[PDB]
From Swiss-Prot, chain A:
In resting T-cells, up to 40% of surface ITGAL is constitutively phosphorylated. Phosphorylation causes conformational changes needed for ligand binding and is necessary for activation by some physiological agents. Belongs to the integrin alpha chain family. It comes from the Eukaryota. This is Integrin alpha-L. It comes from Homo sapiens. Heterodimer of an alpha and a beta subunit. The ITGAL alpha subunit associates with the ITGB2 beta subunit. Interacts with THBD. Interacts with CD226. (Microbial infection) Interacts with SARS-CoV Orf7a protein. Residues 4-175 form the VWFA domain. Leukocytes. It is found in: Cell membrane. The chain holds residues 153 to 334 of 1170 of the full protein. Integrin ITGAL/ITGB2 is a receptor for ICAM1, ICAM2, ICAM3 and ICAM4. Integrin ITGAL/ITGB2 is a receptor for F11R. Integrin ITGAL/ITGB2 is a receptor for the secreted form of ubiquitin-like protein ISG15; the interaction is mediated by ITGAL. Involved in a variety of immune phenomena including leukocyte-endothelial cell interaction, cytotoxic T-cell mediated killing, and antibody dependent killing by granulocytes and monocytes. Contributes to natural killer cell cytotoxicity. Involved in leukocyte adhesion and transmigration of leukocytes including T-cells and neutrophils. Glycans are attached at N36.
Amino acid sequence: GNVDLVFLFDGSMSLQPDEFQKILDFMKDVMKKLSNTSYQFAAVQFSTSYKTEFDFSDYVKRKDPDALLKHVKHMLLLTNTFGAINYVATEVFREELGARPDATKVLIIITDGEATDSGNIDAAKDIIRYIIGIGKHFQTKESQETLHKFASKPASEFVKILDTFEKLKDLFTELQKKIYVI
Amino acid sequence: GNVDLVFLFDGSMSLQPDEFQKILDFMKDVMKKLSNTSYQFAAVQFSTSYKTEFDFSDYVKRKDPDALLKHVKHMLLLTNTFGAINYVATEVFREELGARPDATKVLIIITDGEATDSGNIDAAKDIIRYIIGIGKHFQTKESQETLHKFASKPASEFVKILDTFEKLKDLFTELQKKIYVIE
Ligand SMILES: [Cl-]
Ligand SMILES: [Cl-]
Ligand SMILES: [Mn+2]
Ligand SMILES: [Mn+2]
């Protein structure tokens, strides 16, 4: 059926220009591969606060990813992941913003550090959540574990730990192996 | 005889990751085709500032283009072309870094926008300079003309204007047609 997918991407101070761009490129990669399908997208940048870079309606209006993400400006602040996920659940997955009531909601969270806030993401639990943790800040098993609470279960399936930003291309190569005409 | 060639590549903010990658791929194709010859290479990324990604010595120690360029990080800043060329002439073409004294010096400058700086490139005049301007920013003849000052003469020979980054593939195809075993 229809799938409404939101890319919630980290725009923290830790990110170097090329790493940030690499996060954005993975997003573009997935979009252009899934162009003209039942998939519809929205992208939200999060750091201390949040910004819907383009919503579902924007996407359908002009499906071009490079264009849709042209005005993105790296926030360079903190990593308030709990608030960010809640913002997506209540402020992005909305009909007035182009979300289809029927669609399966999917969230792809991309981050390079532990959340700088706390609370709960109860309001977003019906959304299928994937989280990609990248870089040195996720060197230890402990840091990696902290991400499980944001993603769907099992974590072995929904949580992806990447050692480098370059590995995003690797991740894209693998996700494509899972594309099928059904 | 021996040829010391430096690729001076644009790492400005305008470039999309795949566009930057195409510039890198062109460089790798040229290097691979010219492996085990009298050519030795060095690569320098320029934007607001410069970074010798690998020097002649690095190339001699390890010829693998992929390995040599694997640590390149897109700068995503300005386009100080005058400063970059001067940097190549005075900080890259040096025996200290593997350059061969009486080798023919060649520079292949690749860019997608007009220079954000000014001055002169007198320090680099004895280097055979080629320049490839790519994309939307070189739509007008006026913009293409601003690149003449950086390249050797005639411009008809040293200045290449490409409308797309995909066109770098055709350029590689063209240059290969000029490859000969010189007697
Ligand atoms: Cl951070
Ligand atoms: Cl630029
Ligand atoms: Mn961070
Ligand atoms: Mn540029």
